[PDB]
Design an enzyme around this catalytic site. Structure first.
Site, PDB file in Angstrom:
ATOM      1  N   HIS E  17       0.809  -1.220   0.000  1.00 21.88           N
ATOM      2  CA  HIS E  17       0.000   0.000   0.000  1.00 21.88           C
ATOM      3  C   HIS E  17       0.844   1.274   0.000  1.00 21.88           C
ATOM      4  CE1 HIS E  17      -3.343  -2.558   1.990  1.00 21.88           C
ATOM      5  NE2 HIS E  17      -3.606  -2.424   0.701  1.00 21.88           N
ATOM      6  N   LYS E  41     -18.793  -5.695  10.906  1.00 25.78           N
ATOM      7  CA  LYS E  41     -17.903  -5.258  11.981  1.00 25.78           C
ATOM      8  C   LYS E  41     -16.628  -6.091  12.117  1.00 25.78           C
ATOM      9  CE  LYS E  41     -18.459  -5.765  16.392  1.00 25.78           C
ATOM     10  NZ  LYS E  41     -17.226  -6.541  16.706  1.00 25.78           N
ATOM     11  N   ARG E  90      -2.112  -6.412  -8.102  1.00 32.52           N
ATOM     12  CA  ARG E  90      -1.122  -7.474  -7.942  1.00 32.52           C
ATOM     13  C   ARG E  90      -1.376  -8.586  -8.949  1.00 32.52           C
ATOM     14  NH1 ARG E  90      -3.334  -7.496  -1.869  1.00 32.52           N
ATOM     15  NH2 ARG E  90      -5.167  -7.381  -3.236  1.00 32.52           N
ATOM     16  N   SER E 127      -3.458  -7.531   3.160  1.00 30.62           N
ATOM     17  CA  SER E 127      -3.817  -7.328   4.559  1.00 30.62           C
ATOM     18  C   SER E 127      -4.382  -8.610   5.155  1.00 30.62           C
ATOM     19  CB  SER E 127      -4.856  -6.206   4.700  1.00 30.62           C
ATOM     20  OG  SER E 127      -4.365  -4.974   4.217  1.00 30.62           O
TER      21      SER E 127
HETATM   22  N1  LIG Z   1       1.134  -5.280  -2.852  1.00 29.59           N
HETATM   23  C1  LIG Z   1       0.297  -4.439  -3.508  1.00 29.59           C
HETATM   24  N2  LIG Z   1       0.696  -3.762  -4.614  1.00 29.59           N
HETATM   25  C2  LIG Z   1      -0.126  -2.933  -5.283  1.00 29.59           C
HETATM   26  N3  LIG Z   1      -1.400  -2.697  -4.909  1.00 29.59           N
HETATM   27  C3  LIG Z   1      -1.928  -3.308  -3.820  1.00 29.59           C
HETATM   28  C4  LIG Z   1      -1.091  -4.230  -3.042  1.00 29.59           C
HETATM   29  N4  LIG Z   1      -1.855  -4.690  -2.038  1.00 29.59           N
HETATM   30  C5  LIG Z   1      -3.074  -4.111  -2.153  1.00 29.59           C
HETATM   31  N5  LIG Z   1      -3.116  -3.291  -3.223  1.00 29.59           N
HETATM   32  C6  LIG Z   1      -4.249  -2.458  -3.679  1.00 29.59           C
HETATM   33  O1  LIG Z   1      -4.558  -1.461  -2.697  1.00 29.59           O
HETATM   34  C7  LIG Z   1      -5.925  -1.066  -2.848  1.00 29.59           C
HETATM   35  C8  LIG Z   1      -6.637  -1.074  -1.490  1.00 29.59           C
HETATM   36  O2  LIG Z   1      -6.497  -2.370  -0.906  1.00 29.59           O
HETATM   37  P1  LIG Z   1      -7.449  -2.847   0.304  1.00 29.59           P
HETATM   38  O3  LIG Z   1      -6.830  -2.487   1.645  1.00 29.59           O
HETATM   39  O4  LIG Z   1      -8.849  -2.333   0.021  1.00 29.59           O
HETATM   40  O5  LIG Z   1      -7.514  -4.444   0.159  1.00 29.59           O
HETATM   41  P2  LIG Z   1      -6.330  -5.548  -0.025  1.00 29.59           P
HETATM   42  O6  LIG Z   1      -4.934  -5.116   0.371  1.00 29.59           O
HETATM   43  O7  LIG Z   1      -6.572  -6.193  -1.368  1.00 29.59           O
HETATM   44  O8  LIG Z   1      -6.845  -6.523   1.140  1.00 29.59           O
HETATM   45  P3  LIG Z   1      -6.896  -8.093   0.878  1.00 29.59           P
HETATM   46  O9  LIG Z   1      -5.732  -8.357  -0.052  1.00 29.59           O
HETATM   47  O10 LIG Z   1      -6.712  -8.630   2.261  1.00 29.59           O
HETATM   48  O11 LIG Z   1      -8.262  -8.309   0.273  1.00 29.59           O
HETATM   49  C9  LIG Z   1      -6.538  -2.040  -3.843  1.00 29.59           C
HETATM   50  O12 LIG Z   1      -6.464  -1.460  -5.167  1.00 29.59           O
HETATM   51  C10 LIG Z   1      -5.561  -3.194  -3.857  1.00 29.59           C
HETATM   52  O13 LIG Z   1      -5.610  -3.861  -5.111  1.00 29.59           O
END
Ligand SMILES: Nc1ncnc2c1ncn2[C@@H]1O[C@H](COP(=O)(O)OP(=O)(O)OP(=O)(O)O)[C@@H](O)[C@H]1O
Ligand SMILES: Nc1ncnc2c1ncn2[C@@H]1O[C@H](COP(=O)(O)OP(=O)(O)OP(=O)(O)O)[C@@H](O)[C@H]1O
Ligand SMILES: Nc1ncnc2c1ncn2[C@@H]1O[C@H](COP(=O)(O)OP(=O)(O)OP(=O)(O)O)[C@@H](O)[C@H]1O
Ligand SMILES: Nc1ncnc2c1ncn2[C@@H]1O[C@H](COP(=O)(O)OP(=O)(O)OP(=O)(O)O)[C@@H](O)[C@H]1O
Ligand SMILES: Nc1ncnc2c1ncn2[C@@H]1O[C@H](COP(=O)(O)OP(=O)(O)OP(=O)(O)O)[C@@H](O)[C@H]1O
Ligand SMILES: Nc1ncnc2c1ncn2[C@@H]1O[C@H](COP(=O)(O)OP(=O)(O)OP(=O)(O)O)[C@@H](O)[C@H]1O
Lengths: 157, 157, 157, 157, 157, 157
Positions: E17, E41, E90, E127
């Protein structure tokens, strides 16, 4: 009456292909297998060989006929009295390719395409891979119709 | 005569869905939209609302009827006088899911499934996303049939 | 000696699973099927049923044993005397999921994962879909080992 | 004793490739890197260059040897005393391609294929792209073994 | 001036992120990280914890601010003075999901979405998976910012 | 000021391409369309034709200019005063290809790539398919800018 065209290069026709023909033939009044030979002369079997192999492999489908295709599939469909295109999907790659062509075909001519899923046992079967394995001495006879096997056995020596 | 079942939850029916109905209806003698309500009570519209929205959105398709489904789609197909299942594909995810179900359905009952590609303009349209956007105040009226819009406008207040 | 862990929920074990066990057992000195029950109590068979079904379905694999897993697979691998993780892949979805977990597992513990491709005939077989079809009255007996069929026949009535 | 063949064109070998070799070598009694040169003469390095680069890049793997492949990988496996094929997967495209070949290989010869996931840091590394970038003046030295870098530096001028 | 919103649940924020934030911040005049907490929740960290972790992890980005989101991202963009949405990709699964949402967002509000590719080293980081591994005793500290690690160490006991 | 390069072969430019240009131009201070002609002489339009078609199709974008590219896109970006690369994605195949190139480009030069999703109505549009259909007599005029249509009409006879 409804009519499905099943276009392809069929070089050579495989059991996966025949499976699709059978499933189309069970759903449409008539089926036409349209053989499209790609401009590049690099194909294993000539047009007449391809035609004969499909005919010989589909004698159990009285409502199917084999024809050579020229130009756009959608023109073949509209001019030659069909109502739809039928194609098989094995993989995600097939899906992406065929999705694009189907949308393009609907756009240019209003012709619909119906897809059918591969039988699981033939999911890995393709003309290209079968030819490549056969030419290196691998046994692909369980993947191809007997009329193809007969001709492959002669072509390899 | 041939007959296609188009199963789904249709909660609610979208213009993408109607597009598939239209394309099936043009190819099969009759079409039956089979509404399957998922066991979990968490759906926007009740069965009768779903039925009414589909009926009202398909008055231009004289060879289509709407019914509630129970149990396996393949049993509905075989018992209720159809010949095939028709489903739409928007994405690679749809393809993988539907491929599995089609192969399973062919295995257990010999029933074929034909897929049609989404119209490009509705490729991103899904009942879930439309509902989610609508509930947050977004305008999805161009993605849904008027009979659905009318009911969505009442349901939101 | 090398050792492969094949983790999963196996609820219930399918012929696809047994196929993977057989292929791992042919390559590694020993195999341990590690049953991981997901926190949510919503599973068809209890732990002991799952264990028994796997044992009964693998009597032909003398170098395989069945155990309940707790915590990280990589801890099971390192503590319990294995050298690698083995998992099957049917689809692009499996690949994406398993790729992520394998990279995470290599990162946290240095433990390698080897994948094997599904047998074509079982590519559409999953515990979830088999359970869903069986509960709606579909015949999935050709997709599951006899010890599972025997128990499914009792569980359905 | 078990033995894995890692077939490929290795033109040239990359750090992604060496990573796979290392992981195979840690799991199998012996590993044989089988270099298959594609019929089309358009490759950067000749067979002997390819062989030397792999040997020089794997001196730390005492249980690995390098050989030229001819014909079907499965024949190399069966005749030359191996037990399995090992291949790496970076992407969904690799997965689809390799899945097909693995199923074909199991069908024709009963030979199993095990896949390993790319290390995240090398996921984008391919011989083709590295060659293309290098020829346009890009620095790819962090993606390739030093014995390859040394030869690439000479080949570019 | 241009402005990018980077929406997400960030529960918790990861190094993947932060990488996206950095790359957006380098291209847009300002960036707003919009934290959207999902109705269910069941999330690890409360809104205020999430906010604090992002702030503490982005002190090196003077043109970035953190805010809680409510309702449609596109409304946040239009009302709160941004010009675009930025999201990371990803995997193929991310691509399909994000493609749909981007097309929906362009349709309902004319708001553009720009995607950036994951850094290879964080491609497997999510996450959800990080939380799951951490709760089972796995060391994920190299995948998360120190302000998250500090809080994860307290939360686990 | 920020600057985006939109590299491609544009042989010929399509409405999908122009859509991407428009969306980049709305977000970046300047845009440069970089035409890269592939070494293989087999392309429909020569460099000057390609340049002219893009210029004529983008007169409504005052902050866009057209240039011929040579060598690595990242060198064009760094030397010629841009800050980022912008590319469109239609499909999973585009995503995989572009992801690899973006990661490679970030690795070799630190240059970022931003992707934008295709407009749904142009998702199936590609230069290759449009050319192939046009050469077989299909009407693709709704998929291409008028300056391209004008030239395609002359080129076909
Ligand atoms: N390693 C990464 N590289 C690039 N973008 C990412 C990465 N991890 C998450 N993102 C992107 O960050 C944005 C917000 O992510 P969000 O916290 O909503 O979910 P997430 O990290 O995909 O959680 P989970 O993978 O547990 O579902 C989304 O566009 C997601 O695709
Ligand atoms: N095993 C199979 N099951 C279902 N459909 C198939 C199968 N094999 C091929 N098809 C489909 O048959 C149609 C015509 O195939 P065609 O002969 O043109 O190429 P192909 O078999 O894909 O050749 P190759 O795989 O070597 O490229 C295409 O829709 C293709 O997707
Ligand atoms: N825009 C579309 N084009 C073509 N087919 C579609 C479209 N939208 C849905 N379908 C297909 O319609 C069938 C029934 O859909 P159903 O109502 O069960 O779920 P859905 O529309 O996918 O809902 P959601 O997308 O919210 O999960 C499925 O085959 C689905 O793939
Ligand atoms: N037919 C099959 N061929 C190869 N591998 C399989 C097959 N079915 C499942 N697997 C693999 O077996 C491992 C354990 O599977 P598990 O019981 O955890 O879930 P599953 O069978 O995928 O259940 P479901 O499909 O219902 O989610 C996973 O790697 C899974 O990918
Ligand atoms: N970074 C990597 N990680 C894991 N496996 C890899 C990696 N790069 C290549 N491989 C695998 O190594 C094997 C042999 O590769 P080969 O040299 O034949 O082609 P390649 O590296 O894919 O070349 P190109 O990418 O240019 O087509 C294949 O299984 C390939 O998937
Ligand atoms: N309809 C579209 N929407 C969004 N992006 C597109 C579209 N068509 C092409 N692109 C993108 O434009 C960029 C340049 O495209 P380029 O002219 O190099 O090839 P192309 O259009 O993919 O040609 P072909 O499809 O025939 O291979 C690439 O990022 C490509 O993905």
């Amino acid at each position: 009456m409804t009519g499905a065209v099943c276009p392809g290069s069929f070089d050579p026709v495989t059991l996966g292909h025949v499976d699709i023909f059978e499933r189309a033939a069970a759903q449409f009044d008539e089926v036409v297998v349209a053989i499209l030979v790609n401009p590049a002369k690099t194909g294993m079997f000539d047009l007449d060989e391809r035609i004969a192999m499909v005919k010989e492999s589909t004698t159990h489908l009285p409502n199917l006929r084999v024809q050579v295709g020229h130009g756009l599939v959608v023109d073949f469909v509209r001019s030659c009295g069909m109502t739809a295109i039928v194609k098989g999907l094995r993989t995600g790659t097939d899906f992406e390719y065929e999705l694009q062509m189907a949308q393009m075909n609907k756009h240019i001519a209003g012709v619909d395409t119906f897809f059918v899923a591969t039988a699981p046992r033939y999911s890995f079967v393709s003309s290209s891979l079968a030819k490549e394995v056969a030419m290196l001495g691998g046994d692909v006879s369980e993947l191809l119709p007997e009329p193809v096997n007969r001709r492959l056995r002669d072509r390899l020596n």
